Amino acid sequence: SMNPPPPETSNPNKPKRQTNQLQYLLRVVLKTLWKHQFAWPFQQPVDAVKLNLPDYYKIIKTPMDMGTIKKRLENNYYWNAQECIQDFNTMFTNCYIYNKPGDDIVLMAEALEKLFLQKINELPT
Numbered sequence: 689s690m691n692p693p694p695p696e697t698s699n700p701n702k703p704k705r706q707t708n709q710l711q712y713l714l715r716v717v718l719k720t721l722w723k724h725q726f727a728w729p730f731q732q733p734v735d736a737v738k739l740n741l742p743d744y745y746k747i748i749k750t751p752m753d754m755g756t757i758k759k760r761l762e763n764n765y766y767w768n769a770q771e772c773i774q775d776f777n778t779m780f781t782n783c784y785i786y787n788k789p790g791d792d793i794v795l796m797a798e799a800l801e802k803l804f805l806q807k808i809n810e811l812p813t
């Protein structure tokens with residue numbers, strides 16, 4: 689059991705643009721979640737070898753983490769704000785698929801998801 693390569697943070701065969709929404713997702717949404725006290729388990733891909741979680745990448749076939757989302761925003765990987773919001777949703781959903789109710793990681797995901805929703809609420813037009 690080993691780790692997959694992390695998600696792509698670059699697509700050479702994809703146009704790029706700067707929008708108010710993408711800038712807000714990096715500078716306000718991601719930055720706010722990144723600095724939250726419960727951010728640390730979500731700042732990098734799950735390392736199944738280091739943490740000894742051999743069934744993680746048997747159960748989770750669409751991994752996502754805030755380190756990947758950060759790099760995607762910084763590299764102008766996303767064309768649509770929807771793509772970035774979908775990646776956050778995937779990250780939270782994976783946590784609820786793999787882990788059990790009352791697990792520390794699940795209550796941490798709940799706290800971050802609540803904050804995420806409050807910040808996306810004020811996403812500009």
Ligand SMILES: COCC(COC)n1c(-c2cc(C)c(=O)n(C)c2)nc2cc(N3CCOCC3)ccc21
Pocket residue numbers: 728729730734739741782783786787792793796
């Ligand atoms: C609160 O989460 C605890 C779990 C423990 O998994 C066995 N965990 C995850 C983790 C995260 C997610 C989203 C998940 O689903 N699982 C199962 C584990 N990522 C981690 C990273 C670290 N370290 C801290 C020191 O620096 C290196 C990294 C330490 C613990 C971690």
